[PDB]
Design a protein around this ligand. Structure first.
Ligand SMILES: C[C@H]1O[C@@H](n2cnc3c(N)ncnc32)[C@H](O)[C@@H]1O
Ligand SMILES: C[C@H]1O[C@@H](n2cnc3c(N)ncnc32)[C@H](O)[C@@H]1O
Ligand SMILES: C[C@H]1O[C@@H](n2cnc3c(N)ncnc32)[C@H](O)[C@@H]1O
Ligand SMILES: C[C@H]1O[C@@H](n2cnc3c(N)ncnc32)[C@H](O)[C@@H]1O
Ligand SMILES: C[C@H]1O[C@@H](n2cnc3c(N)ncnc32)[C@H](O)[C@@H]1O
Ligand SMILES: C[C@H]1O[C@@H](n2cnc3c(N)ncnc32)[C@H](O)[C@@H]1O
Ligand SMILES: [Cl-]
Ligand SMILES: [Cl-]
Lengths: 290, 286, 291, 291, 290, 286
């Protein structure tokens, strides 16, 4: 029972995703294609990365992740296919599922993506066992569509991998320095305050996500129940204790400062939108201190 | 051939829904997950209820409906899981339609009133709290009970985990319900609200029902005056469908697929040019 | 392993698509339902036609395409079901889709079921058809259809019977060619040495600009990759670039690229930036090309 | 104490109006310049005409109205200067303006100077005129006018000479009636017992709705204060109210009022709330009235 | 040299204001008409009031203020004309002008307005010497336009007053209880914090004005140089000392908490807009404390 | 017959401008106040400068220009008051125009660069700091120096208060100037910026001047290619006016009333449909 989990920038306004899916079911008759999302900001590899980094532990072993934003479509560039090392615990650290969670064995998931840095945080968080350039005409078209490499060089070969084509056969092995990566912005300790950035607005709720992690917090002594001052955009400070969840803020509309399901320091209002009335946005400065 | 039909307020702009689906396939390898929608206004229990209330008759017997908006996530609250009784009409499908046996569907949802109308329309045979670590995490992620307390246990139920083993039976009073706004009277006009804009067409749906109408003496021929937001008046005979208005753009006053007084333009949008909205008053007279 | 690929104007904000899907699994339990899209502008049959015309070569033979925008719901009109002839190559070069030399698809191997309102105009034009039938039989539609929901009653439902193996010729009577409603499509005019058409679509979510000037139209004027072109939009915007395979060929990020899209049509874009969104360019605007 | 009342399409965001004013005080030192408005949609002569047609009765006799939208700036066209005949009553009842029984104004006592582009169509129609002249004399316009600024060169400047006492008949040659450009205005049709016109304007900043159905048109059908009316807008909105003098007559705040505006025209509004803004009603929409 | 200072809700998009001005110059040949503003939110008498309350000290003695929003136009209602008592010092309290300012004698300005509460704060701040109902056909039309009382019952009689028509002759005297007034929202002392409201956004800068006055501040001990916490909309707190001016915030974009030229506690950014990016609005809660 | 022409960033949505005017009439009973505009983008010194630079030739001799955006309000800063020399062309008005004597106009402004282009184009005969309590308040309102340090002293100057008595003479270096962006070269294309959108018409004005053009070999007949924001290309002959384009909506490339390369549609807006903006690059080639 093979699964391909599919994350693109193709959107859902036309037949582009369906074209890829038609070919996936064509190549791997038994497959199940699960949509991750197709809504990412085009060409923003850092945003694409956040949508895929945390997926392994949720999926059955053997799952292939077809993940693509392909601004270098139709060039001489070729995709990278990697088998990861650890499925890894996550959240605000645990295995996912009922009971004590589902423990995932090492080397049980493959990502196939453009070699443009999309997989940077996947490789940082999970490690990898082996990496290959995707070049074989057994898995890609002999004459690929210049402007559709997300289909030609990701969707199509991912379905061959789902169908059982040996990963080592897709092309030559890539050395670590041949896999492109993006530079991750570092959390700064500024006196005793921690300085990062709004990493994401959490749609559709309007919760605010920072790149300040739970590990960064236990570094400066911060745990659940700590009074914090969190300044956004350099001028809007908020104040609240760190709490597990939204309803701990008290009344509806009140401010909650919490750890999100991905482990990162976040801010919201209790059953109300914070970001949307005050037009708060990704990329704004975020500062925290007790 | 187990099915989970999935309705949430998680949206489709990140991997939140995919995390839930991943766990569904892990738990029930042979499952088919059907998306209902994930677009609902966050925390609007009456809105989410509208999207799930008439689903059973359309699905194969044995379908599990996983339906969630969870603003009380991470608290001591636990989900409710119910088996409904009557799948409830006409029947849907080709010919005279497909009849559905009683007790053939399970809903699992936060215990916050989301299931209010499902229970009124269909009734139930059994209701339980979802507490067993067989079907939910021992360390549940505080901010993601739509995943922990709905998605995960729905998939155990799809795989044949016995309903009565999820936790203790709930008595009726323990099952939270929302109050639904009444259709009131002033003179011979009926006063209600706009209960929804029908995206993407811009049709207007009111809470004034077939039954409220015929009781006040209105059937499929009646010339009606329909005033919206207390300002915009519309006038037209009650008709079965849009094209009964004649010209493209003409006004149709009709009954939507739920028996509710509705208003639209024929093959054009009514709501969008006039910025008509849910929650606006709707007053009708013959 | 039967597939129904589903395209409608029902949107993704309520339970309308799910009702259709439920009834698909009810009638054909082993079916796989693949969403094409549900976002088309309601009642724009020309736009709907664009999202379904290119589908066959990507799908397994025996696939059923349920394609629907239904402004005449609740009327005496009934849907039309067609077996197409050629699965038809396509793309910028014109080839089969898939790895290696692509997946060659046999003739008469796909069914489309749709309102009889012109939605299938380009499907028939580009693929031809082998047989067409009016969808009237109570075996495949409800005896009491919901007046406002013919996308479900007259398309979703019968499509699932067809996917289950219900004989096509049994849905109702054969339709003569003149009984299949069509729309007229704009002809690219050969004006001097220029080619005059329109912006056919904005390519969401990138804001690329698609015209109705097809690759074969370009070969009427003898224009291939490397040709220095002037592509004028909206009468007043004379863009200038060589015709190149892809976006990155334009050099720096933001530079204008003139290219052939994945559907075989003359297009214009910027390299890893949006052309249509900043300047609010729209479908329907004029598009002129010349060398 | 000469007055120039000034209406243009120049806006209030730069120094364009001030340049015109400066030259007014330069040519006629004791002048008072009164802004009519500078907000009209550029080049919409019909809208401009609405802001100037009702002016004479409010102003001292001898006032000069400099009224300008000039899309043909820099061309061989020259402005036209007119002495009107009747100052003309008006308003919902039809009377003179001011305290007591109002200020009665004499015949032939106001001058309008404008581009010869139809801007003065309703002025002449409603007031008549006694003499008209092309504005050509270097005594009142520049010998080298700025190509893009004929609102200044061919209207502001000569208007200030006229206010200073420059003889009207000396600006240039007399113009025959057919030489004064006009636009055609929509005729309210007598359809059955209904009267069919349009929404002429949105009354900013209140969002009241003005139609082109005049009080005298209502008296063709015999409609006065107290008459229960149906006023249908945009073909689909049948408003119902008695015809009343004013807004508060409708009762509660927000209730629909149907009334005669201060310009003598059939209008519709809400009592101390906006009708046009919430529902995005627009000029050009249809307006039908009947009793 | 008579002056009429003219404040309406008529806007500047049509000839409505010019009609009034034509009649003003008709009635009072020597007059100068100064526009206060015509931009107010229609029918909002509290907003109209803020635009007129502070005008007397700036204008020559003898000035008439014609001030109007007239939602009761065309009814039996009649305007009120009042001679004020004190011109009054103002600002963050002084006379206006070069040197030590221009001292204005008592009873030297007249307001004419609808009797709908528009003049509430004028009468509270300045007092009055005499008040009259405007009813004489020597100053108003015998048949006034039903829908244009701002012209008929304000503009027109104001010009008669400018022209020298005796104020006592416009109609009968009104007793204090016959002059309509609006209820002013009270500043609350909530513990040691002061609770009011955003009274206005200061266009075009996007500065935020509160109804918390300098007097309210010296009541709780607050002067220039006091560290303050100011919460807006119940969730956005800001922190800054109270300073005289914007540039005291330091760098451009920094927050300044100050007293405005009208005497009220205010918040802004130094040469940047505060209200506009965060969509802050009139009517939002405002809380302050040291 | 004294005149004050008044330009500020105070807007027209409250009584800020009326307070200033009130004080002008108090100080100079016989004054005429002319509004220039009050709409300028707050604190944009180059923008406000554009609105005041060519005013003198249009006004009677003896006019005082009160011109202010004052982001440094309430600090130790004091305003500058200058008498300009050459009123500077053609001359404006009927006939051959009205010549203006030298030294006939005074500007008074914050000393923040607002007067940069006025001084470059016209020159000056004398410049002073505004410090005398004869002409400004002793207790100046900290947040309203546009009123205290511009409006009030301008009106004393209109009334005949001697210029040299406002405070001490300033040397040229004490008068703050802004740097103006240069028109540069790349190949035979000239590169500049859009210096303004011409509201309300939506015409586009560039900083590429008549002089920059003719030096590169371009006159009133030249077919030019004009690219805006680095993306949108336009092509058209250089013409005197809009109507030279022919059809309504056609493209005109012309010189605005300041000698600057400009682009527009004939009797339609160019900037608004395309969302063209000030600060966007403008590149021209013959
Ligand atoms: C197949 C890939 O083409 C890329 N793509 C789409 N449009 C552009 C563009 N204008 N420039 C560069 N890349 C683009 C998308 O990222 C898609 O994933
Ligand atoms: C897992 C559940 O978390 C809830 N959720 C998301 N954001 C908030 C918030 N600010 N307050 C309360 N609940 C929230 C959603 O309703 C989702 O269904
Ligand atoms: C079931 C079908 O109903 C059609 N539909 C929905 N709303 C309208 C309307 N206002 N007018 C005409 N057709 C409509 C949709 O096109 C859908 O496909
Ligand atoms: C003469 C006065 O008419 C008032 N006015 C304008 N429109 C309305 C309306 N729709 N309802 C009530 N009053 C209105 C304005 O406030 C103006 O000042
Ligand atoms: C009196 C002067 O005050 C200035 N002004 C108004 N708001 C601000 C602010 N937030 N920062 C700096 N200056 C400001 C204006 O520029 C006005 O001209
Ligand atoms: C001096 C006159 O210039 C006219 N004007 C300004 N811009 C344009 C344009 N793009 N097209 C035509 N006329 C224009 C205005 O209407 C003004 O009145
Ligand atoms: Cl799916
Ligand atoms: Cl004025």
């Amino acid at each position: 029972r093979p699964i391909i989990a599919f994350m693109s920038d193709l959107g859902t306004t036309d037949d582009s995703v369906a074209q890829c899916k038609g070919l996936m079911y064509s190549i791997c008759p038994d497959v199940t294609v699960v949509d991750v999302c197709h809504s990412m900001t085009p060409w923003d590899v850092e945003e694409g990365a956040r949508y895929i980094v945390d997926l392994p532990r949720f999926f059955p072993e053997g799952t292939v992740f077809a993940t693509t934003t392909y601004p270098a479509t139709g060039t001489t560039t070729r995709s990278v296919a990697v088998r990861i090392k650890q499925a890894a615990k996550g959240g605000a650290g645990q295995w996912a599922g009922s009971g004590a969670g589902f423990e995932r064995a090492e080397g049980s998931y493959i990502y196939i993506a453009p070699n443009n840095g999309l997989l940077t945080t996947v490789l940082e968080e999970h490690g990898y066992l082996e990496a290959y350039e995707v070049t074989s005409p057994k898995v890609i078209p002999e004459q690929p569509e210049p402007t559709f490499y997300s289909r030609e060089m990701v969707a199509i070969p991912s379905a061959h991998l789902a169908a059982g084509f040996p990963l080592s056969e897709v092309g030559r092995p890539l050395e670590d320095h041949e896999i492109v990566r993006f530079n991750r912005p570092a959390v700064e300790q500024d006196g005793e305050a921690l300085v990062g950035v709004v990493s994401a607005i959490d749609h559709p709720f309007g919760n605010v996500w920072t790149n300040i992690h739970r590990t960064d917090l236990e570094k400066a002594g911060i745990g659940y129940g700590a009074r914090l001052r969190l300044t956004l955009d350099g001028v809007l400070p908020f104040e609240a204790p760190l709490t597990p969840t939204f309803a701990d803020a008290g009344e509806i509309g009140n401010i909650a400062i919490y750890l999100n399901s991905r482990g990162y320091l976040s801010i919201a209002r209790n059953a109300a939108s914070l970001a949307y009335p005050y037009h708060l946005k990704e990329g704004m400065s975020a500062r925290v201190e007790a």
